[PDB]
């Protein structure tokens, strides 16, 4: 398929891998009773193992000669062949959360700079203010862009200290 890979659902090595893991679990099972606590736990593990291998095949992943899933990172190849969920979609999932955390922290830091004693507002968190800013961060991408266009996102070069040069 892509880069010589093949769908895991059609991969011989992938299928053989599932048998090896289930065989290992089954070997430990036969040293216990039918419905003892250890036996139930082992059976639960085997169910998750079977579900995991079905899910990855159902997801249409690609397996190499190793018979293990490989991920596609190029946006063009991902959207071309329906691998957007491996790296492309999770890319924009992380950035939203990462920007959320960073934007919320920046809002709080600016908020307390106006207080009389900013340092004491950092070791001892102002929880009522932090919760207020935590919820308003859901719209950070909109607020972040508008700050950039209005020119209030960055400090002036003349207001930043620098070493002799």
């Amino acid at each position: 398929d892509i880069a010589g890979l093949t769908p895991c659902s059609e991969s011989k090595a992938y299928a053989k891998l599932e048998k090896k893991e289930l065989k290992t679990l089954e070997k430990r099972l036969k040293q216990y009773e039918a419905d003892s606590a250890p036996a139930v736990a082992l059976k639960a593990t085997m169910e998750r193992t079977k579900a995991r291998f079905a899910n990855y095949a159902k997801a249409g992943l690609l397996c190499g000669n190793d018979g293990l899933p490989h991920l596609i990172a190029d946006p063009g190849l991902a959207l071309k062949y329906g691998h957007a969920g491996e790296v492309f979609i999770p890319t924009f999932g992380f950035l939203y959360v990462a920007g959320y955390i960073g934007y919320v922290g920046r809002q709080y830091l600016i908020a307390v700079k106006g207080e009389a004693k900013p340092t004491d507002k950092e070791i001892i968190i102002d929880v009522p203010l932090a919760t207020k800013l935590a919820w308003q961060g859901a719209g950070w991408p909109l607020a972040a862009v508008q700050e950039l266009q209005r020119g209030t996102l960055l400090e002036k070069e003349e207001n930043i200290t620098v070493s002799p040069r």
């Binding site: 919820w135 308003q136 719209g139 909109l142 508008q146």
Partner: protein, 217 residues
Amino acid sequence: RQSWLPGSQIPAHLDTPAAQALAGNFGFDPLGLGKDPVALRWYQQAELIHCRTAMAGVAGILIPGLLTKAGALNVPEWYDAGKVAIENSFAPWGSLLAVQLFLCGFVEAKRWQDIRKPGSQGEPGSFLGFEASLKGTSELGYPGGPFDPLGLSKEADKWADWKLKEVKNGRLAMLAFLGFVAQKYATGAGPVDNLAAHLKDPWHVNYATNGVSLPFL
């Protein structure tokens, strides 16, 4: 002072006289997206275009849907009409969309330049004598002129009332479309068919029992 949530503190930026001049101002801005006055002016235009586009689209899903059930028309489901139309069509969907982007892009571009410089499209000689009627009105997002053939915007007494009706039906239409999308995945049927099912047995056919919305239950 009507508000979306009585007893709550209206955001300060929504209480200014400029903000209260906006139709449908019920003080709803919990995330503070409109704090910057320049941003709120831009988001108001976005709502109007979303409102008007949603109303036209919903009317195109709902009215054909009811008439189809009544037997006066035969129109496929809104989520199938795209495939049905392209078959007995003079062009493939690639060519059809490319033209759509040129025409929409050109028209949208003129609207864009009016947001940046209101009344700037009435530049003498810019259009083939038609620029005079493209100046818009004193209110951004309400062009008027050739876009108001019946002149319903010339009655000062009814002006505020008309704008409120548009935003109210527009907001309702926007939610309706979000319901069409969610109800297609949830139930796998048409909008009017979903309504028929609910009315038959309201207490057993709803989102609480569709087996999707509440996975824990």
